[PDB]
């Protein structure tokens, strides 16, 4: 492979430069916007995923599975990341910021909110965020081993350089990884919402894969 041969700093580099761009936006109105945005971000996600160390080492069939499984999780952690600085609202696009007064979903809107404020209080860093995202891609459909261990080292590496103590390092790790469970939760609930709106072919094929 290749991923396992990367140092912590290289791993961070590879990821930081694989980062997809932040896209701009263009019940029936709001969702048409999210699906349109989501659809366009998917293209960028596919090519970003390939730039994730270890992902290329997967067969096409395995690569398709992880993305079908994790994509909405990928989108959501990104959204929450964009929304840190904007307490109380969600920043899908710089020109698309929505409050809970519009989501009427509202419960999901809240969970994403709480998730963003959690990143804020933890002062989640970009390098930490890129690691977490690569983790969601590799782990969610995993049911990768040694590739995931590597990112762990990378995360600890990042925290250590930040000046954190031995104890602090392992509880921030814990805290961080615990949020993926919630993001898995929001994704599944969201996937149910997407399904009821269906009672683009790509987004439809993505939804069907999950059901």
């Amino acid at each position: 492979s290749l991923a396992l041969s990367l140092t912590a700093d290289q791993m961070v580099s590879a990821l930081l430069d694989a980062e997809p761009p932040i896209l701009y936006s263009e019940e029936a109105s709001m969702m048409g916007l999210l699906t349109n945005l989501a659809d366009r971000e998917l293209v960028h996600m596919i090519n970003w995923a390939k730039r994730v160390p270890g992902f290329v080492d997967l067969t096409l069939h395995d690569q398709v599975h992880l993305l079908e499984c994790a994509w909405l999780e990928i989108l959501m952690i990104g959204l929450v990341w964009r929304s840190m600085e904007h307490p109380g609202k969600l920043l899908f696009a710089p020109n698309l910021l929505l409050d809970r007064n519009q989501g009427k979903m509202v419960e999901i809107f809240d969970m994403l909110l709480a998730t963003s404020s959690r990143f804020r209080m933890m002062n989640l860093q970009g390098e930490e965020f890129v690691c977490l995202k690569s983790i969601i891609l590799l782990n969610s459909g995993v049911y990768i081993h040694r590739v995931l261990d590597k990112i762990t080292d990378t995360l600890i590496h990042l925290m250590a350089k930040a000046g954190l103590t031995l104890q602090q390092q392992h509880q921030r790790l814990a805290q961080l990884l615990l949020i993926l469970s919630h993001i898995r939760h929001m994704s599944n609930k969201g996937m149910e919402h997407l399904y009821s709106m269906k009672c683009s072919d790509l987004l439809l094929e993505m939804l069907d894969a999950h059901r």
């Binding site: 293209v43 390939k50 690569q63 398709v64 993305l67 079908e68 072919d201 790509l202 094929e205 993505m206």
Partner: peptide, 9 residues
């Protein structure tokens, strides 16, 4: 499957 295509090129 579209994902099959996008992942190739």
């Amino acid at each position: 499957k579209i994902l099959h295509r996008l992942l190739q090129d």
